Design a protein around this ligand. Structure first.
Ligand SMILES: CCCCCCCCCCCCCC(=O)OC[C@H](COP(=O)(O)OCC[N+](C)(C)C)OC(=O)CCCCCCCCCCCCC
Ligand SMILES: CCCCCCCCCCCCCC(=O)OC[C@H](COP(=O)(O)OCC[N+](C)(C)C)OC(=O)CCCCCCCCCCCCC
Ligand SMILES: CCCCCCCCCCCCCC(=O)OC[C@H](COP(=O)(O)OCC[N+](C)(C)C)OC(=O)CCCCCCCCCCCCC
Ligand SMILES: CCCCCCCCCCCCCC(=O)OC[C@H](COP(=O)(O)OCC[N+](C)(C)C)OC(=O)CCCCCCCCCCCCC
Ligand SMILES: CCCCCCCCCCCCCC(=O)OC[C@H](COP(=O)(O)OCC[N+](C)(C)C)OC(=O)CCCCCCCCCCCCC
Ligand SMILES: CCCCCCCCCCCCCC(=O)OC[C@H](COP(=O)(O)OCC[N+](C)(C)C)OC(=O)CCCCCCCCCCCCC
Ligand SMILES: CCCCCCCCCCCCCC(=O)OC[C@H](COP(=O)(O)OCC[N+](C)(C)C)OC(=O)CCCCCCCCCCCCC
Ligand SMILES: CCCCCCCCCCCCCC(=O)OC[C@H](COP(=O)(O)OCC[N+](C)(C)C)OC(=O)CCCCCCCCCCCCC
Ligand SMILES: CCCCCCCCCCCCCC(=O)OC[C@H](COP(=O)(O)OCC[N+](C)(C)C)OC(=O)CCCCCCCCCCCCC
Ligand SMILES: CCCCCCCCCCCCCC(=O)OC[C@H](COP(=O)(O)OCC[N+](C)(C)C)OC(=O)CCCCCCCCCCCCC
Ligand SMILES: CCCCCCCCCCCCCC(=O)OC[C@H](COP(=O)(O)OCC[N+](C)(C)C)OC(=O)CCCCCCCCCCCCC
Ligand SMILES: CCCCCCCCCCCCCC(=O)OC[C@H](COP(=O)(O)OCC[N+](C)(C)C)OC(=O)CCCCCCCCCCCCC
Ligand SMILES: CCCCCCCCCCCCCC(=O)OC[C@H](COP(=O)(O)OCC[N+](C)(C)C)OC(=O)CCCCCCCCCCCCC
Ligand SMILES: [Ca+2]
Ligand SMILES: [Ca+2]
Ligand SMILES: [Ca+2]
Ligand SMILES: [Zn+2]
Ligand SMILES: [Zn+2]
Length: 164
């Protein structure tokens, strides 16, 4: 099962975001492109509609933070945790908080925001991990370029199991 166990449900269809704050590590244009491109994965396989606002409330608050920051959790440092993604719904939750003591880079063997944000939006929609050794929701990372990116049959099967 590629779904999160429990009853993940948003009951919301038209979803929006704001990028809270821009990282020094990779610049604001390259962030807002990476997070556009992340979102635009799951629209090609969802009936959900995703938009960006510049006024009002973001449903999925994308925020770049470090430390014991709130929410008890903690972000670790360089390495370890890449995101605190929540699960779906209104309020605090439905959100994907990234670690900023992480050093995020668009180079092939450095920490990729695109490939993480995709699963972190997935975590937020109610997806867990996959178990086919070609999937993106597999635990271990495998690097794939931004634009030659494709979801694997298992991963598509898991969002279609959930929203079908
Ligand atoms: C009817 C008559 C009306 C007259 C109107 C006069 C004109 C008013 C114009 C208002 C201009 C408002 C500017 C604006 O919205 O600023 C918002 C910003 C950014 O919003 P946003 O982009 O979400 O920033 C997010 C990132 N973060 C969390 C790192 C801040 O916010 C900031 O960047 C954060 C600012 C923090 C200030 C903190 C001060 C704390 C200590 C002082 C507390 C005093 C309490 C009374
Ligand atoms: C009449 C009774 C007293 C009323 C005066 C009370 C004091 C008002 C304080 C306003 C302080 C303005 C501070 C400022 O520069 O705001 C910039 C905002 C930007 O907000 P935003 O775009 O959210 O910035 C986001 C940053 N990000 C993405 C990295 C997270 O940009 C704006 O939203 C555009 C408007 C900025 C200026 C607003 C105030 C103009 C002057 C107000 C009165 C001055 C009297 C000397
Ligand atoms: C002694 C105790 C009292 C001290 C009072 C201190 C008041 C401090 C006000 C300014 C705080 C600014 C701190 C700061 O650097 O925020 C940076 C962020 C993100 O930085 P980040 O992008 O994380 O990289 C930081 C280093 N960088 C750019 C050189 C590569 O940038 C943002 O997230 C965007 C928001 C930009 C606001 C630009 C506002 C400039 C006006 C500052 C106040 C002017 C009064 C003359
Ligand atoms: C007698 C009790 C009367 C009560 C009347 C209250 C009526 C208020 C009407 C509000 C309608 C417009 C709302 C709207 O479009 O808001 C947009 C912005 C504020 O957006 P906000 O996201 O807060 O700031 C956006 C920019 N950012 C991110 C850089 C900070 O803000 C704007 O762009 C500026 C719009 C100013 C609207 C002034 C309307 C004056 C009508 C006054 C009627 C008689 C009052 C005596
Ligand atoms: C200390 C600082 C001030 C703190 C208080 C500020 C005000 C508190 C109440 C704010 C309520 C704002 C209402 C407002 O946003 O109206 C906006 C509309 C439509 O804007 P729209 O952009 O569609 O909705 C904005 C919000 N958004 C971005 C999240 C989707 O646009 C309007 O429909 C147009 C403007 C109409 C104003 C009419 C005022 C009528 C007064 C009549 C008096 C009759 C006396 C007999
Ligand atoms: C000079 C500038 C100073 C600024 C100081 C801080 C001011 C706090 C402003 C809070 C205003 C929030 C306005 C609000 O309506 O936010 C709504 C968003 C989403 O609402 P949403 O369900 O999308 O639309 C509501 C329904 N509609 C379409 C029928 C209007 O939902 C929210 O984002 C959830 C509510 C957040 C509550 C935050 C309340 C803070 C109170 C303490 C402020 C202390 C400031 C020192
Ligand atoms: C009745 C009135 C109520 C007054 C407010 C009460 C609020 C009480 C609840 C506080 C919750 C604080 C949660 C928290 O730690 O948020 C921190 C955030 C982000 O996490 P963090 O990673 O710490 O941000 C570090 C800087 N960054 C963005 C560049 C990576 O921090 C940021 O994004 C920076 C925001 C601007 C902070 C500028 C400095 C404010 C100094 C004064 C604080 C006054 C508090 C009363
Ligand atoms: C100032 C006069 C001298 C004070 C005596 C100090 C005596 C020893 C105190 C304990 C030693 C603390 C040393 C220190 O600098 O701690 C600062 C802390 C944490 O520093 P640190 O953990 O490096 O910050 C890491 C990064 N961060 C912000 C992203 C989490 O900073 C924070 O965690 C930020 C605190 C934010 C509080 C915001 C308001 C929260 C309570 C509001 C309640 C409102 C209703 C009452
Ligand atoms: C500043 C800008 C940048 C921000 C960067 C990201 C910063 C992250 C801060 C962490 C996020 C903060 C959001 C927040 O409001 O959390 C409040 C928490 C829990 O809210 P809650 O609605 O319980 O959480 C529901 C959703 N959940 C469990 C799935 C997450 O609640 C608590 O923390 C507990 C607080 C004590 C509440 C005690 C009760 C108050 C009412 C008492 C009524 C007494 C009646 C006699
Ligand atoms: C003598 C006993 C008296 C008790 C009176 C009531 C006390 C209620 C507040 C209790 C707070 C206790 C500590 C706690 O739960 O902190 C929660 C988290 C901490 O996560 P953590 O990362 O450990 O925070 C490090 C510190 N920080 C945020 C400054 C970097 O930090 C948060 O997540 C920050 C966000 C907090 C949102 C608070 C919203 C309250 C909404 C209440 C509306 C109803 C009021 C009637
Ligand atoms: C209570 C009298 C307050 C008078 C305030 C007048 C000024 C209001 C300024 C605007 C504040 C925000 C208005 C608001 O509810 O906006 C929507 C947000 C977020 O919407 P969303 O995230 O979609 O959640 C929607 C579902 N909903 C509304 C049922 C929670 O929903 C929320 O953020 C819910 C926030 C709830 C705060 C409840 C505090 C109870 C304290 C104990 C009071 C005891 C009463 C006897
Ligand atoms: C007679 C009637 C009196 C009514 C008084 C109001 C009573 C009801 C208050 C609202 C209660 C909820 C407040 C709260 O927790 O706001 C948090 C929001 C976002 O939390 P949210 O993401 O909505 O989840 C909150 C969950 N909750 C309520 C279960 C804790 O936080 C945010 O949206 C961020 C806001 C950051 C504001 C920082 C302002 C710093 C100072 C700015 C400059 C001031 C210059 C004058
Ligand atoms: C509600 C009543 C009780 C409230 C009690 C709490 C009051 C707290 C007020 C805020 C004090 C700041 C607390 C604190 O030390 O937190 C630590 C932050 C570090 O967080 P952050 O900057 O994210 O971490 C920096 C390091 N980095 C890039 C590797 C991640 O910051 C630092 O370590 C430096 C703190 C610098 C303060 C003075 C800044 C002078 C700036 C001069 C440049 C602007 C001049 C206009
Ligand atoms: Ca980390
Ligand atoms: Ca949310
Ligand atoms: Ca960083
Ligand atoms: Zn957290
Ligand atoms: Zn993963």
């Amino acid at each position: 099962f590629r779904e999160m166990p429990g009853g993940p449900v948003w009951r919301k269809h038209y979803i929006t975001y704001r990028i809270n704050n821009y990282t020094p590590d990779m610049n604001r244009e390259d962030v807002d492109y990476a997070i556009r491109k992340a979102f635009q994965v799951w629209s090609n396989v969802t009936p959900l509609k995703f938009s960006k606002i510049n006024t009002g409330m973001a449903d999925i608050l994308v925020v770049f933070a470090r430390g014991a920051h709130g929410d008890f959790h903690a972000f670790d440092g360089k390495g370890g945790i890449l995101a605190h993604a929540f699960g779906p719904g209104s309020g605090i939750g439905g959100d994907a908080h990234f670690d900023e003591d992480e050093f995020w880079t668009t180079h092939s063997g450095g920490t990729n925001l695109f490939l993480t944000a995709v699963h972190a939006i997935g975590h937020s929609l109610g997806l867990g991990h996959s178990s086919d050794p070609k999937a993106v929701m597999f635990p271990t990372y495998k690097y794939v370029d931004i634009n030659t990116f494709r979801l694997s049959a298992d991963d598509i099967r898991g969002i279609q199991s959930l929203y079908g």
